Amino acid sequence: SHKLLIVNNHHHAKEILIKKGKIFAGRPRTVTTDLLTRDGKDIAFADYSSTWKFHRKMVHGALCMFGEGSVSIEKIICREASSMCEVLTESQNSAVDLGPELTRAVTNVVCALCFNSSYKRGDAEFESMLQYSQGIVDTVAKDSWLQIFPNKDLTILRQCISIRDKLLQKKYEEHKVTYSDNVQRDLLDALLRAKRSSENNDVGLTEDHVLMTVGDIFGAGVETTTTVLKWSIAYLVHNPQVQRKIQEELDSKIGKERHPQLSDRGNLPYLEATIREVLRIRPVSPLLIPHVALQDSSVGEYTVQKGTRVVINLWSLHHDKKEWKNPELFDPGRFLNEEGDGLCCPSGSYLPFGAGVRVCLGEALAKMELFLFLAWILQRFTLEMPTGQPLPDLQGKFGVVLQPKKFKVVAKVRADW
Numbered sequence: 001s002h003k004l005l006i007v008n009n010h011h012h013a014k015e016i017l018i019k020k021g022k023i024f025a026g027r028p029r030t031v032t033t034d035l036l037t038r039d040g041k042d043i044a045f046a047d048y049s050s051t052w053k054f055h056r057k058m059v060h061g062a063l064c065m066f067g068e069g070s071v072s073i074e075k076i077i078c079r080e081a082s083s084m085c086e087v088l089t090e091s092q093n094s095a096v097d098l099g100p101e102l103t104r105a106v107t108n109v110v111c112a113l114c115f116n117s118s119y120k121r122g123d124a125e126f127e128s129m130l131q132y133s134q135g136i137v138d139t140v141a142k143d144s145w146l147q148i149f150p151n152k153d154l155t156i157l158r159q160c161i162s163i164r165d166k167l168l169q170k171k172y173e174e175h176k177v178t179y180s181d182n183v184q185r186d187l188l189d190a191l192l193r194a195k196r197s198s199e200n201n202d203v204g205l206t207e208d209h210v211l212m213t214v215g216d217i218f219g220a221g222v223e224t225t226t227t228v229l230k231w232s233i234a235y236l237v238h239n240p241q242v243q244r245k246i247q248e249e250l251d252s253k254i255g256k257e258r259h260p261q262l263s264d265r266g267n268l269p270y271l272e273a274t275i276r277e278v279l280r281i282r283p284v285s286p287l288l289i290p291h292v293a294l295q296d297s298s299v300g301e302y303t304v305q306k307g308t309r310v311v312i313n314l315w316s317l318h319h320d321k322k323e324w325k326n327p328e329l330f331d332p333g334r335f336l337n338e339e340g341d342g343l344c345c346p347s348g349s350y351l352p353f354g355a356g357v358r359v360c361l362g363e364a365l366a367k368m369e370l371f372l373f374l375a376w377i378l379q380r381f382t383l384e385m386p387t388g389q390p391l392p393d394l395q396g397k398f399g400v401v402l403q404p405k406k407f408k409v410v411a412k413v414r415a416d417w
């Protein structure tokens with residue numbers, strides 16, 4: 001038996017996430033989340049703590065400084081987009097599912113970021129990892145509620161968890177044998193280094209904490225960013241006028257003798273607006289992760305007892321007709337100033353990455369990927385539907401992230417390229 005509070009109001013939501021971030025920083029325990037995270041030794045389901053804080057810090061620095069030398073995540077993202085556009089080119093004018101090829105690209109980013117590797121098309125590990133994440137995402141479809149069906153199976157959930165565990169366990173053991181105090185190749189070395197240094201001396205740096213942390217970054221990095229691109233492909237296809245505004249922005253502000261760079265960000269607010277609006281309209285986590293009162297508090301008038309679960313309904317925040325004119329329409333211009341000069345936050349109701357204390361750890365990285373990937377593609381391609389075939393159903397099932405139904409697009413090369 002457990003008590004629960006669903007928040008449809010943004011003022012309240014910011015009283016939880018921010019004003020009283022720490023009081024509502026607890027996470028909930030479920031048989032499934034416990035398998036996933038080893039009883040909460042990861043970050044995303046780890047109660048607020050010096051460990052939680054510390055690992056969250058490791059990941060921010062690892063990302064800052066991966067590295068190396070002079071070589072940033074930017075290079076790797078650009079590399080992965082270049083390969084995408086080469087795929088789109090041979091796979092060209094034909095109808096084609098961008099799903100799997102997009103997923104690998106996003107994966108090589110975070111695979112680089114965590115383990116200093118990449119996957120090749122067809123790779124057997126990568127394949128295995130698509131598969132097992134399938135089962136995992138599918139069976140964390142549980143309020144961790146329209147229950148009732150004989151369940152479950154968490155015989156298969158466990159099956160996947162282990163395949164994952166062996167994947168990580170191999171990368172862990174590999175990194176050790178080649179580990180060098182001078183260099184730090186990735187988030188794993190970063191933590192291995194941390195771990196050794198704890199031997200020289202109550203922040204938890206056991207093997208489980210290391211593995212679970214990297215697991216979180218390897219996991220989110222693929223399932224979240226990838227989904228958002230799939231939504232952008234959908235919405236782009238539905239709105240040729242948005243595609244075209246984006247393209248003519250790229251044409252004037254980057255040109256044609258050159259590819260987009262991250263330095264270009266602040267010269268392309270229409271694209272940034274477009275990204276924001278995808279994140280508004282099909283928010284990738286529509287419930288965020290739940291929050292748990294670590295002590296009795298209040299949420300303006302509502303009192304709230306220690307232990308109660310707390311679920312922001314970001315969907316309903318992002319679609320209140322009171323906060324958003326004509327929600328349910330895709331309009332990047334929500335997020336642009338009166339002229340188009342630059343950006344403009346049209347409401348306090350927008351918290352796609354969350355806010356305050358448990359805010360998305362990958363926010364920074366998600367935004368870089370999303371920008372480069374979409375910019376690189378739209379500069380060279382224009383995305384239509386096949387020959388004579390209805391626009392994509394935008395309905396979308398909710399696993400651990402809210403993701404769309406698959407479809408086939410036609411990337412036509414642009415008259416210049």
Ligand code: HEM
Nearest residue numbers: 044217220221224225288289352353354358360361362366
């Ligand atoms: C691409 C779009 C993404 C969105 C919209 C998003 C959104 C969010 C949201 C809503 C939360 C929960 C906020 C809360 O519970 O208060 C969160 C947590 C988290 N996100 Fe993301 N995220 C995204 C991508 C990523 C990526 C790419 C990573 C890669 C490392 C990542 C790592 C995390 C982690 C570790 C947490 C847990 C933070 C904590 O509970 O302490 N996210 N994100």
Ligand SMILES: C[C@]12CC[C@H](O)CC1=CC[C@@H]1[C@@H]2CC[C@]2(C)C(c3cccnc3)=CC[C@@H]12
Nearest residue numbers: 044133136137215216219220223224285400
């Ligand atoms: C289950 C899954 C995705 C399937 C992988 O096989 C394992 C995995 C690890 C961490 C989870 C992730 C889904 C997204 C999660 C739940 C989350 C997240 C969710 C949405 C936005 N940002 C972060 C942070 C931890 C992430």
